[PDB]
Amino acid sequence: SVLQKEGIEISEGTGYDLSKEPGAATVKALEQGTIVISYKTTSENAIQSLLSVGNGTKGNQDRHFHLYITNAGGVGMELRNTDGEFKYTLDCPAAVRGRVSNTVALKADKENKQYKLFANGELIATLDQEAFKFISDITGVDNVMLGGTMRQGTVAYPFGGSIERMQVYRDVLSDDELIAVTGK
Amino acid sequence: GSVLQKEGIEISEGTGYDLSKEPGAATVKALEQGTIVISYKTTSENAIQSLLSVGNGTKGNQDRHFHLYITNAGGVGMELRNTDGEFKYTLDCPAAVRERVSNTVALKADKENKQYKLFANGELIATLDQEAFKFISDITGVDNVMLGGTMRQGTVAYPFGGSIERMQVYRDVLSDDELIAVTG
C-alpha cells in the first residue's frame, strides 16, 4: 500500500484528515489503483464518504473523488472534475447490510479503462468509460481524508463510526484478490 | 420493430412533448429491457436535457424516473431512479458529441447480461454492469412518457430545446453492431 490506516474512529461531521501523512502526495496523483476499506457505520446520514481525495477550495466543490456508503446498505463512488469534464459514478443498492463490519473495494484499471466495485466478497458493479479518468485528472487536488469530502472547506458527506482498515494501492489488484480481501 | 416511434418533433425549451397517450406508451412504461435510439439537434444551453423520459410525475416521486439525456457540454447520459434507497443508476459520458449539428445516440439495457451500453455517432462510449439489474418496470408508479424533459412533481425538469429528429424505442435488445451502424 502507498497509504494505510487502521482503527480510526470518526465522529459524524468531523472527518479525519490524512493530507499531511507520508503517502498522501502519491494518493493525490493516482492515475489508477485500488482502495480497500473495512468499516462500521454508526451514522444515519444518507451519503457517507469513507475515503475522499479532492480539491477543497472555494468554487471547486465538484472536483473530487470519493468512495462512499449510504444509510440504506448502498456502496458507491463518484469521480468528478466539474460536470463538463467528467462525472463518473457507481452507486449500488443493498450491497451491504442496511452495527456490523463490512469491507468494500474499488479498482480503477487504466489499461482496461474500467472501474470495479466490490463488497463483502462480491463484484457488484463494473464501469467502462471510453475516456478513462482518475485522481490525477482532477484539477487542484489538495486533500485526502477519511469520513467525508471537503467541499469549499466544509466536511460534506459525513461518516460516523469506525474506519477499521483503509489501504490505498498504486497497483491494480486482481478481481480474485479483491473477492478474497473483501470477504471475512 | 419499434414499440414507439416519433419523427420531426420540435420542442421549445421547457415545453416538452407528451407521448403518454400514444399507442405503445404503455409498453414503454413497463420495459424490463430494451433499446432507445434518438437523433436530435439541441439549441438549448441547459446543463441537463432529457431527450426521452419515462417516470412518475406525481408529487413526492421526483426521484422515480428514467431518462436518456444530453448536456450543454457535448455530453450524453442516462439516469434510472426509484428513490436513492432503491436505485440510482447513472451513466454520464463527457465530450461524446460535438453551425449546430445533428447527433445520434442510443441506450441499450440488456437484462440477460445485466448491462447498460451507451452509443453516440457510431461509437460505444460506456458500459455499466450492475449486479442488481433494474429497468423501467422496476420504477414505482410510472405514469408518463415524454420527449424533451422529465416530469418531476408536475414540472418539466431537465428541459430540452431544439429538434427530436427521430426517436425509436424497442423492447428488443439490439446488437452492438446494429447500434454502431444506426448511430453512425
Residue numbers in the entry:
A (entry chain B): 8 to 105, 111 to 196
B (entry chain A): 7 to 104, 110 to 195
Task: Tell me what the authors wrote about this structure, in their words.
Ruminococcus gnavus is a human gut symbiont wherein the ability to degrade mucins is mediated by an intramolecular trans-sialidase (RgNanH). RgNanH comprises a GH33 catalytic domain and a sialic acid-binding carbohydrate-binding module (CBM40). RgCBM40 displays the canonical CBM40 β-sandwich fold and broad specificity towards sialoglycans with millimolar binding affinity towards α2,3- or α2,6-sialyllactose. RgCBM40 binds to mucus produced by goblet cells and to purified mucins, providing direct evidence for a CBM40 as a novel bacterial mucus adhesin.
